[PDB]
Design a protein around this ligand. Structure first.
Ligand code: TYR
Ligand code: TYR
Lengths: 438, 437
C-alpha cells in the first residue's frame, strides 16, 4: 500500500553495488551458451506480470507510466490534475528545470524496484524449491539495463551504426521454463511495446488517454493516442484509417534511420559542424567548465554552440525513437514520416523503451557528476530548485515519510546500483573516448 | 488428389461476381456500418487454411510452396525442377510468356480454396437463421486485388501509393456469427504468415533454406531459414538472428519505396523516369504491342514503357525489401530485405496473392483493349500449349483430368470471376485514365 517507499533494491552484503548493464551486452550474454538465462527470464516474466496488473493497482505498468504524464491522475496518495503555466494538463515529471535529471533518477529507480519485487514473487510461485536460492541470487544481481543510444551496435567480427536495443526490436522472446533444462518457451516480449485490451481512449474514468496536441509547420494537430490500443514507433500518420492507428507497429528501421541521420530540432546556425548523436554525447561528457544548471536542463537558456545539454539531447532522442511527424512532410523528409508515443511527453512513458532511454540519461548524469564533482545545484540559476520536493516519490527520513529531494540522490549508489563506467573512475576519461570519441 | 481447379462454382443467383479493390472492400465492410460478413469469412477461412498441417496440400504453407521453396511435390506432381542457373526452382513460371497465365490459375486456386473453407466455416459456425445471408455473402466474395498503382483514398483523392489498409493491421475485428451485435479482435492472417518453428527446421522435405541473391555484383545468402515469420524489410546483414526470426512488417518502408519507385532497370535514354502509377498507365495504353512484349521479360531478354512482368518484379522488390547488405549512406533509407523480394519465398507473404490478383486484373484490362493479341507473335507462339503444372482440371469434352493450358484461361470469366473495370468495354479507356492517368 501507501505510502510506497522508494529505496532501490535492498542491500545484500554478498551483492555489493550491482551494475546496470548495457542492454545489448546483457541480452547477448543471457542468450549465450555460457549463461543460465535466468535474468532474462526473470525480467520478461516480472514485466509481463506488472503489465497485466489492473488499473486500480498503482504498481501496474499503466499506473507507473501514468506518473509521468497522461492521464494525469493521483499516484501513491499524491493528487494529480495539475496544470502547466500554459494552463494545460501536466504530470509529475519534471521537464525544463534543473531537477530534470534527479526527478528521473528516482523514477527509473521506482521502476527497477517494482520489477525486482515482482521477480521475487515469480520465484516464490514458479521455481522448484531447490532452485529458488539460485534464482534469488540472480534477481539480486539484476539491475535495470540501459540503452546506450550513443554507442555503435555490435555487428559481428568478420566485417558504425547506432541502433535500438536488439531485444526492443523482437516481438517474441524465449525464456526458461524453471526446472526444465533445455526447454524454452517463446512469449510476447514485454519490452517490444505496451498495449491495453481496448483503445486507450476508452479506458474507465479517470484513466482514459486523450489525443495530445502537437505543432507541425505552424499548424496544430491532434496526435491520436486515444485511438491506439498499442504504443507505436512512427506508426501514426495523418490521413490513414484509424484502424491502422490501433496498432501502428514498432517501425524500428525508421527509428534507427533517425538516430543515425540525427535531425536535430535546434538551429545549428554558426556551428563549426553538425555533430552526430555519438559526437554530441561525447561533447556533453567532455566539455569542461560547465555548471550544473548548464548541463542539466534546457531551462538555462543566444545559446551555446558546438555542444548541447543533457535534456536537449534527451529531447531529440525521444523524437527520433517515437517519430515526430504526424502530417505528411516534404519529399526529402518522407523517409522519416510518422509519429508515435516516445515523441510526446504526455504518453512517452507507456513505450517500454522509455525506461531504458532514461536509464542511460541517468548513466550520463552519473558520468558527468564523476568528472564534474564540484557542480551540483550551486550556480545562481539552478540553486533555487535544489530543495524542490520530487513528488510523488516518498522516502523514509525524523522517523517520518517525506518526499524525495535532489540531494537524497546525488549519490546514486545510495539507491544500491552503479554503472561499470562510474565504478572504474580511474579509467573513466579513457572509456568515454573509447565509446564515444570520433 | 487430384484437386480439380474450377474457380468458385457458378450459382445462377450470383452472375460473375467481382474481385474488388481491397481498400474499397475494407471500407465497404467497416465504414458505413458493421457490414462485416465477407471480412469475417475471409479472416476466419484464411486462418483455418494457415493452421492446416504440412501433410495437407491445401494448407497455406503447401499452397505457397507451389510457387517456389521448399521445391516439393504438390497434387501428385513431382518437384525437382531446375531454373536457368541450374538451381532448384518451383512450379511458378517467370521469364516466359506464360507468366500471366500460370499466375492466373494460381490465384484462382487460392481463391477457390478460401471459398471452400468459407463454406465449412458457415456450416460449423452460423445458426440456421443466418445461413442464407452468410452463404449469399460467400458466393458473392471474390479475392480482392491490391491496386498498387492507385493513390490511396483519404478517408477524397490521395497523393500516395500504399500497401492495403488491412495488410498493415496486426489485428482485425470480426463478427460472432451466432451473436448479432458482438465482435472479436483476432490476429489478422493477411498481416504476415508464420510457422510454429523457424522455417529452416521444418520436417523433411519442407525446410526452407537460405536463398542466394546478388547485390551490387556480390553473392548473399538471404537467411529465410532463420525466419519464423515472413517480413517486409526486416532482414539486415550483421543483425542478430533473433531479430531475423520475426523482422516485422515494416510497411512504412514499403510505402516509401512504392512512391520513390527505384526501378532496377537502366532507364538511360528514357523520356522521363515514370512513377509506378504512370508506368502502369503506359502499360495499359501503349499501342501496337503484342502478347510476347506485354507478358514477359523474355521478349527483350535484357522504350519508354515497361512490360507487365518487369513492373511486377519491381513491385515485389519494393514491398518485400531488396537490400540485405548495407548500402551507401545515401540509400540507407530503404535498407532491408524480406520475403516478397525473393522468388523462392515470396508466396509465403499473404500480400503476394493480392499483388498477383492485380497482375491478373492488369492482364484482363490489357486483353480487353488488345483483342486478338494472345500467344500469336513469332516469339510467344511456342509456349502457348505449355502445361501449366501442377494445376489440374476436368476437361468436359473428353471427361479427362488434364493440366491447365493458357487457352483455358484466356477468358478469365470462365473461372467465374470478373473485375468491375472489365464489365463495360465502352467505359474501360476512360476508367484507365481516371485511375492512372
Ligand atoms: N517532443 C519533445 C521531446 C520529448 C518527448 C518526450 C519526452 O518524454 C520528453 C521530451 C520536444 O520536441 O522537445
Ligand atoms: N527479385 C526479383 C523480382 C521478383 C521477386 C519475387 C517474385 O515472386 C517475382 C519477382 C527481381 O529483382 O527481378
Amino acid at each position: 500500500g501507501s505510502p510506497y517507499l522508494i529505496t532501490g533494491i535492498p542491500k545484500d552484503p554478498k551483492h555489493p553495488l550491482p551494475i546496470r548493464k548495457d542492454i545489448d551486452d546483457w541480452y547477448l550474454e543471457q542468450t549465450s551458451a555460457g549463461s543460465n538465462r535466468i535474468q532474462l527470464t526473470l525480467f520478461v516474466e516480472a514485466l509481463t506480470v506488472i503489465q497485466n496488473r489492473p488499473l486500480n493497482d498503482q504498481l501496474s505498468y499503466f499506473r507507473l507510466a501514468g506518473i509521468h504524464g497522461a492521464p494525469w491522475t493521483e499516484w501513491d496518495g499524491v493528487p494529480g490534475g495539475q496544470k502547466d503555466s500554459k494552463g494545460n494538463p501536466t504530470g509529475f515529471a519534471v521537464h525544463n528545470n534543473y531537477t530534470f535529471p534527479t526527478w528521473h533518477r528516482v523514477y527509473v529507480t521506482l521502476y527497477e524496484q517494482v520489477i525486482y519485487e515482482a521477480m521475487l514473487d515469480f520465484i516464490k510461485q514458479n521455481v522448484p524449491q531447490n532452485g529458488k536460492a539460485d534464482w534469488e541470487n540472480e534477481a539480486k544481481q539484476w539491475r535495470l539495463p540501459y540503452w546506450d543510444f550513443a554507442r555503435f551496435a555490435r555487428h559481428g567480427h568478420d566485417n558504425d551504426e547506432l541502433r535500438l536495443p536488439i531485444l526492443v526490436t523482437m516481438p517474441m522472446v524465449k525464456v526458461l521454463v524453471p526446472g526444465q533444462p533445455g526447454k524454452q518457451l517463446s512469449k510476447p516480449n514485454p519490452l517490444y511495446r505496451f498495449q491495453m485490451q481496448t483503445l486507450m481512449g476508452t479506458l474507465e474514468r479517470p484513466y482514459a488517454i486523450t489525443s495530445q496536441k502537437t505543432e507541425e509547420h505552424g499548424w496544430s494537430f491532434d496526435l491520436p493516442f486515444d485511438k491506439c490500443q498499442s504504443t507505436t514507433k512512427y506508426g501514426l500518420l495523418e490521413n490513414y484509417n484509424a484502424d491502422v492507428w490501433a496498432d501502428g507497429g514498432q517501425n524500428w528501421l525508421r527509428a534507427n534511420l533517425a538516430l543515425n541521420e540525427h535531425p536535430w530540432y535546434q538551429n545549428l546556425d554558426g556551428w563549426d559542424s553538425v555533430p552526430t548523436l555519438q559526437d554530441m554525447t561525447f561533447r556533453l561528457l567532455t566539455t569542461g567548465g560547465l555548471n550544473w544548471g548548464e548541463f542539466s536542463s534546457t531551462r538555462y537558456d543566444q545559446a551555446p554552440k558546438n555542444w548541447m545539454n543533457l535534456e536537449a539531447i534527451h529531447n531529440n532522442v525521444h523524437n527520433w525513437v517515437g517519430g515526430f511527424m504526424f502530417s505528411r512532410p516534404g519529399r526529402h523528409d518522407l523517409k522519416l514520416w510518422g509519429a508515435g508515443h516516445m515523441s510526446s511527453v504526455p504518453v512517452a512513458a507507456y513505450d517500454p523503451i522509455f525506461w531504458l532511454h532514461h536509464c542511460n540519461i541517468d548513466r550520463l548524469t552519473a558520468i558527468w557528476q564523476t568528472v564534474n564533482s564540484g557542480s551540483w545545484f550551486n550556480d545562481d540559476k539552478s540553486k533555487v530548485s535544489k530543495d524542490d520536493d520530487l513528488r510523488p516519490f516518498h522516502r523514509f527520513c525524523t522517523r517520518k515519510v517525506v518526499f524525495f529531494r535532489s540531494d537524497d540522490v546525488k549519490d546514486w549508489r545510495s539507491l544500491n546500483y552503479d554503472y561499470a563506467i562510474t565504478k572504474d573512475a580511474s579509467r573513466i576519461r579513457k572509456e568515454i573516448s573509447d565509446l564515444y570519441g570520433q
